[PDB]
Tab-separated table of C-alpha atoms in Angstrom:
chain	number	residue	atom	x	y	z
A	1	UNK	CA	101.245	65.372	113.838
A	2	UNK	CA	98.415	67.276	114.531
A	3	UNK	CA	100.768	69.418	117.071
A	4	UNK	CA	100.423	71.953	113.881
A	5	UNK	CA	97.139	73.214	114.323
A	6	UNK	CA	95.387	73.325	111.063
A	7	UNK	CA	93.506	76.343	112.113
A	8	UNK	CA	97.220	78.191	113.158
A	9	UNK	CA	99.274	76.763	110.177
A	10	UNK	CA	96.307	78.517	108.064
A	11	UNK	CA	96.649	82.048	108.671
A	12	UNK	CA	100.681	81.622	108.926
A	13	UNK	CA	100.425	79.975	105.553
A	14	UNK	CA	98.870	83.195	104.544
A	15	UNK	CA	100.261	86.222	106.669
A	16	UNK	CA	103.461	85.171	104.760
A	17	UNK	CA	101.588	84.252	101.341
A	18	UNK	CA	97.941	85.120	100.883
A	19	UNK	CA	96.107	88.556	99.832
A	20	UNK	CA	94.659	90.648	102.696
A	21	UNK	CA	91.053	88.879	102.187
A	22	UNK	CA	93.415	85.575	103.093
A	23	UNK	CA	94.234	86.838	105.755
A	24	UNK	CA	91.144	88.840	107.287
A	25	UNK	CA	89.267	85.612	105.956
A	26	UNK	CA	92.082	82.775	107.638
A	27	UNK	CA	90.946	85.241	110.720
A	28	UNK	CA	87.387	85.072	111.473
A	29	UNK	CA	87.189	81.749	112.877
A	30	UNK	CA	88.916	82.594	116.045
A	31	UNK	CA	86.864	86.003	116.049
A	32	UNK	CA	89.374	88.783	117.546
A	33	UNK	CA	88.606	91.690	119.307
A	34	UNK	CA	89.210	94.281	116.045
A	35	UNK	CA	91.897	96.007	117.827
A	36	UNK	CA	93.626	92.748	118.450
A	37	UNK	CA	92.526	92.108	114.852
A	38	UNK	CA	93.607	95.148	113.441
A	39	UNK	CA	97.212	94.773	114.954
A	40	UNK	CA	97.306	91.704	112.793
A	41	UNK	CA	96.819	94.010	109.607
A	42	UNK	CA	99.202	96.092	110.632
A	43	UNK	CA	101.648	93.073	110.578
A	44	UNK	CA	100.402	91.939	107.029
A	45	UNK	CA	101.732	94.799	105.295
A	46	UNK	CA	105.088	94.822	106.081
A	47	UNK	CA	105.037	91.160	105.476
A	48	UNK	CA	103.892	92.374	102.178
A	49	UNK	CA	106.853	94.525	101.378
A	50	UNK	CA	109.225	91.928	101.706
A	51	UNK	CA	109.737	89.784	98.394
A	52	UNK	CA	108.304	86.278	97.222
A	53	UNK	CA	111.032	84.928	97.978
A	54	UNK	CA	112.260	86.507	101.146
A	55	UNK	CA	108.333	85.566	102.375
A	56	UNK	CA	108.487	81.887	101.087
A	57	UNK	CA	111.772	81.360	103.507
A	58	UNK	CA	110.256	82.895	106.345
A	59	UNK	CA	107.386	79.589	105.467
A	60	UNK	CA	110.394	77.524	105.270
A	61	UNK	CA	111.858	79.064	108.278
A	62	UNK	CA	108.756	77.897	110.327
A	63	UNK	CA	109.087	74.511	108.973
A	64	UNK	CA	112.243	74.002	110.121
A	65	UNK	CA	111.501	74.544	113.495
A	66	UNK	CA	108.206	72.833	113.453
A	67	UNK	CA	109.747	69.337	112.259
A	68	UNK	CA	113.224	69.172	114.169
A	69	UNK	CA	113.406	66.546	117.313
A	70	UNK	CA	112.959	69.816	119.643
A	71	UNK	CA	109.698	70.772	118.434
A	72	UNK	CA	107.519	67.343	117.684
A	73	UNK	CA	108.301	65.782	121.323
A	74	UNK	CA	108.178	62.476	122.702
A	75	UNK	CA	105.659	62.367	125.698
A	76	UNK	CA	104.345	59.120	126.597
A	77	UNK	CA	104.659	58.145	122.630
B	1	UNK	CA	99.597	72.056	126.579
B	2	UNK	CA	102.548	71.356	125.082
B	3	UNK	CA	101.396	71.421	121.468
B	4	UNK	CA	102.883	74.849	121.953
B	5	UNK	CA	106.476	73.230	121.274
B	6	UNK	CA	108.522	75.897	124.191
B	7	UNK	CA	111.783	76.362	121.049
B	8	UNK	CA	108.419	77.358	119.196
B	9	UNK	CA	107.169	79.880	121.402
B	10	UNK	CA	110.222	80.585	122.207
B	11	UNK	CA	111.284	82.685	119.425
B	12	UNK	CA	107.758	84.370	118.535
B	13	UNK	CA	108.337	85.778	122.100
B	14	UNK	CA	111.047	87.296	120.747
B	15	UNK	CA	110.760	88.209	117.151
B	16	UNK	CA	108.054	89.966	117.753
B	17	UNK	CA	109.317	90.797	121.237
B	18	UNK	CA	113.404	90.902	122.109
B	19	UNK	CA	116.633	91.998	120.865
B	20	UNK	CA	118.410	90.685	117.165
B	21	UNK	CA	120.322	88.764	120.001
B	22	UNK	CA	117.415	87.634	121.269
B	23	UNK	CA	116.189	86.300	118.020
B	24	UNK	CA	119.669	85.185	116.764
B	25	UNK	CA	119.985	83.382	119.951
B	26	UNK	CA	116.295	81.947	120.164
B	27	UNK	CA	117.232	79.919	116.178
B	28	UNK	CA	120.772	78.399	117.143
B	29	UNK	CA	119.049	75.368	118.739
B	30	UNK	CA	117.333	74.537	114.962
B	31	UNK	CA	120.574	75.282	113.074
B	32	UNK	CA	118.574	76.981	109.712
B	33	UNK	CA	120.148	76.936	106.520
B	34	UNK	CA	121.965	80.454	106.356
B	35	UNK	CA	120.331	81.268	103.383
B	36	UNK	CA	116.917	80.615	105.683
B	37	UNK	CA	118.389	81.958	108.911
B	38	UNK	CA	119.189	85.319	106.884
B	39	UNK	CA	115.631	85.103	105.592
B	40	UNK	CA	114.755	85.182	109.397
B	41	UNK	CA	116.194	88.395	110.102
B	42	UNK	CA	115.032	90.238	107.181
B	43	UNK	CA	111.747	89.827	109.203
B	44	UNK	CA	113.042	90.729	112.335
B	45	UNK	CA	113.671	93.996	111.178
B	46	UNK	CA	109.814	95.310	110.244
B	47	UNK	CA	108.488	94.018	112.651
B	48	UNK	CA	110.817	95.709	114.934
B	49	UNK	CA	109.649	99.077	113.450
B	50	UNK	CA	106.107	98.614	114.964
B	51	UNK	CA	104.760	99.818	118.290
B	52	UNK	CA	105.839	98.164	121.100
B	53	UNK	CA	102.498	98.041	121.702
B	54	UNK	CA	101.352	97.063	118.248
B	55	UNK	CA	103.454	94.048	118.499
B	56	UNK	CA	102.554	93.423	122.208
B	57	UNK	CA	98.952	92.608	120.184
B	58	UNK	CA	100.774	90.166	117.767
B	59	UNK	CA	101.804	88.397	120.721
B	60	UNK	CA	98.458	88.164	122.165
B	61	UNK	CA	96.874	87.707	118.813
B	62	UNK	CA	98.788	84.388	119.090
B	63	UNK	CA	97.441	83.829	121.937
B	64	UNK	CA	94.266	83.723	121.392
B	65	UNK	CA	94.629	81.066	117.953
B	66	UNK	CA	96.865	79.021	120.431
B	67	UNK	CA	94.173	78.667	122.910
B	68	UNK	CA	90.651	78.478	121.910
B	69	UNK	CA	88.834	75.155	121.329
B	70	UNK	CA	90.589	75.315	117.834
B	71	UNK	CA	93.721	74.603	118.232
B	72	UNK	CA	93.814	72.581	121.615
B	73	UNK	CA	92.002	70.051	119.960
B	74	UNK	CA	90.482	67.070	121.513
B	75	UNK	CA	91.961	63.764	119.923
B	76	UNK	CA	91.551	60.631	121.797
B	77	UNK	CA	92.054	62.771	125.376
């Protein structure tokens, strides 16, 4: 379900896994305040310090929340 | 809009800001594989190393994506 706003899954799919460009780029479509933008970069580094497998699990971790009867809720249908 | 699955905003609201308990707890309703669970903790630490204000911005950062005409999309209505 498109609750996983494509734009949102985009950056995560790359904070966690793709180059600094991959982030900065992932981000332009939002146009965050530089201060904010900057906070983002600060984050991207520590994330970069963890192993491919640690970081991969962080991706699987999100996918565990994102696809359980908790998240993909039933409003009306 | 309830696209921000409450459960999902829950943990983030606390990876980024609340105690180790706050995370571990935020997480139980999902029941992740221990290995996965563990990956999560690894994350929570580096996040804990950044300043309150850095981390706060990471919260504002998400809220910037999450509430733009990009994310809160128009399917049908």
